[PDB]
Amino acid sequence: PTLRITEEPERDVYWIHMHANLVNQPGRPCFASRLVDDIVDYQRELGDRLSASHALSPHVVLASDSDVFNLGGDLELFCRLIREGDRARLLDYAQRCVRGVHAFHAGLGTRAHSIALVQGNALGGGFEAALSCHTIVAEEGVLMGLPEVLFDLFPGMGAYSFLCQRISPRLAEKIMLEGNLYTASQLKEMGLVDIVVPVGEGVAAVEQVIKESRRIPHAWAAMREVNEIATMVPLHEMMRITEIWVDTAMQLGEKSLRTMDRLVRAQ
Amino acid sequence: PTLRITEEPERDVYWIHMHANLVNQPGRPCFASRLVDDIVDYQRELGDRLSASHALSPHVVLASDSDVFNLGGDLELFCRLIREGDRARLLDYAQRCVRGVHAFHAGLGTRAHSIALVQGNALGGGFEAALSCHTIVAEEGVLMGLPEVLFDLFPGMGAYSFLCQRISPRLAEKIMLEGNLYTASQLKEMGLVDIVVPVGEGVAAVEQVIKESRRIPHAWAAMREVNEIATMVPLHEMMRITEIWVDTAMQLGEKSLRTMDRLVRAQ
Amino acid sequence: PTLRITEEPERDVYWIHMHANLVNQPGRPCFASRLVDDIVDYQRELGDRLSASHALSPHVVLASDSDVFNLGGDLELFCRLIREGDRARLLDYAQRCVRGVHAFHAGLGTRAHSIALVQGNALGGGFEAALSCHTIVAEEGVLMGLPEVLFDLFPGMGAYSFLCQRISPRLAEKIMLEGNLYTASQLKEMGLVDIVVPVGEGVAAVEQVIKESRRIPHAWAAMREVNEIATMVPLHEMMRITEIWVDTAMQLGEKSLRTMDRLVRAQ
DSSP states (O other), X not given: XOXXXXXXXXXXXXXXXXXXXXXXXXXXXXXXXXXXXXXXXXHHHHHHHHHHTTOSSOEEEEEESXXXXXXXXXXXXXXXXXXXXXXXXXXXXXXXXXXXXXXXXXXXXXXXXXXXXXXXXXXXXXXXXXXXXXXXEEETTOEEEOOGGGGTOOXXXXXXXXXTTTSOHHHXXXXXXXXXXXXXXXXXXXXXXXXXXXXXXXXXXXXXXXXXXXXXXXXXHHHHHHHHHTTSOOHHHHHHHHHHHHHHHTTOOXXXXXXXXXXXXXX | OOEEEEEETTTTEEEEEETGGGGTSOOOOSBOHHHHHHHHHHHHHHHHHHHHTTOSSOEEEEEXXXXXXXXXXXXXXXXXXXXXXXXXXXXXXXXXXXXXXXXXXXXXXXXXXXXXXXXXXXXXXXHHHHHHSSEEEEESSXXXXXXXXXXXXXXXXXXXXXXXXXXOHHHHHHHHHHTOOEEHHHHHHTTSOSEEEOTTTHHHHHHXXXXXXXXXXXXXXXXXXXXXXXXXXXXXXXHHHHHHHHHXXXXXXHHHHHHHHHHHXXX | XOEEEEEETTXXXXXXXXXXXXXXXXXXXXXXXXXXXXXXXXXXXHHHHHXXXXXXXXXXXXXXXXXXXXXOBOHHXXXXXXTTTOHHHHHHHHHHHHHHHHHHHTGGGTTOEEEEEEOSOEETHHHHHHHHSSEEEEETTOEEEOGGGGGTOXXXXXXXXXXXXXXXXXXXXXXXXXXOEEEHHHHHHTTSOSEEEOTTXXXXXXXXXHHHHHTOHHHHXXXXXXXXXXXXXXXXXXXXXXXXXXXXXXXXXXXXXXXXHHHHHHO
């Protein structure tokens, strides 16, 4: 695979393209355990590869082969799991997700620079996916935001953890619970997106970032380490949020459930 | 007794209107020892009442029956207590003052939703009261701010705490000590007031807040709990701060007290 | 030494002008070892004096007699200690540099109000020294910024610590790593500079800040102490960061150190 990885070990730059399968497949780009298990899987793999090769300031890019970035949780999965009373299975998929994004935010245990290239809409966990990377390149016109609150849920993964890095807890809460969508221009204003480049120019934008980020390889390494004893979010602290998140999905009434199923027909 | 409590159990919405004792009495719409004792004790009342009711995301509004939200602490008690040199009974007032705003900040130990309706002016303690609530609705052209520096004191009720949730702690320091005043629209552009509507229409827009918020009671509950880890202001930290405030106010000379009775006299 | 000291003990105001031995000597308005050692040593001196006097809310101003405020750390001492590889002594430089900016932050352990007077450009360690003070007064058309990133270093004598007090730590990091210079006017927009005034009214605006502050000695002391319960950057947390900084400095290659020689000669 569901991932269209791209290796480039001469420059130490690795481009992960999501929904590699959907080129030949029905639809619903989102965070299905297939994709969630492939990103995690690759992450350990390039985590030890780059660690063993002692690569100083590797780059990792998260991107997408679909027409959008990512839609969020696999919605049909939720309904199934919530209905069967299977919280164990739900918590598990949540935890896999936290592990997934936390790696971009922690530079794969290799103090990498993780860039996000958002060429299409990035709702829900897709926005969490996008806020985990260090540098957020979006296109003009893209729409971002998290509408999970229209089903009486919220964005349990990071989001309150990654948003609190650019803004205050009150406003992070507001963005979460207000359930409003936003354009890249707006998100640049709120400092929630790092650089918005013109139509279709986002590909070479991340190329520009790589050129300059590689100019300061020792400095980037001390930053990541310095955040890591100061403001970087601990892994086990995100784990507690999903516990809270998984018990919240587990109480989701039928009215909300039909609404998810409402989004299932047309997701 | 000093509070006019409109409470409706079928909707689980509860309004606390302060200063109702002063519709025929002369004035001082401030944090009179009785007003603090009442506000806190009623919180304790609704406190187990809602916990036994197992209510989920209940709403509590705090508002004013006077022409001002509040005028802050009761400068007459301060003068008299400072003069007698008795921090024992002065610290008691401060603590009971901290227990009232922290209840609103804690959602009353039932993860409630706090909304302050700021119809009048809110000064010092009054302005902190507004700041402890999760939502701040105010009417156009209202003044908020803390002039507690005019007598070489600082707002120790809970301002530092509830400010650093919306704005950087350095800016928190400036606003407190600068002793200035801001109109409600300005405070909106600072992240200090969330909603701002024309005059008269405050109760309406609290009502629109309660509607939308009662639409997602699980997400609210989650946020309360998510906040409760890290984010939320502890109660021992707030206890320490007033213990500093009490020691400071104990060192006040007859100069400051003169300014105090000036303020009492100009309100 | 290496400084001018305008003592004013009846006012409990004290002026520390750096680069006194610059009207008569060569140049390099930077943070030479002696200077850092003279700024520490006088802190201990003034500080024990103020403490033993039982002073309340003193005032220490940091200002420059050279053409600029301070160009920051001594690159000429680093093209030596890195090439020679004496890590022990290099750490010693940063440790004393850290103690130096931190005393200003912490009011010299006497709850004193530090104020930076930015007559001229303040780059690198100069910008940290500035940000370390509680108040920053700067003239029009002055540049401040962190250029050290241009030769693959990172600001590690305080930058992260004192920046995050004013803005988001994702803004802090962007500001360091970008290595841009910002004009005083726009910096004060960014919340970083406190007070922007015309050229010449250097002591003019500082002189007023001193006036307003002693108008409220007791509140300053209280607010100073509250920032000690939970908002003061801990001394040991700052030592830990220097360890990264010097461990970054040993890994510099002739590419970087060549540029520092070029920088040393331009100043």
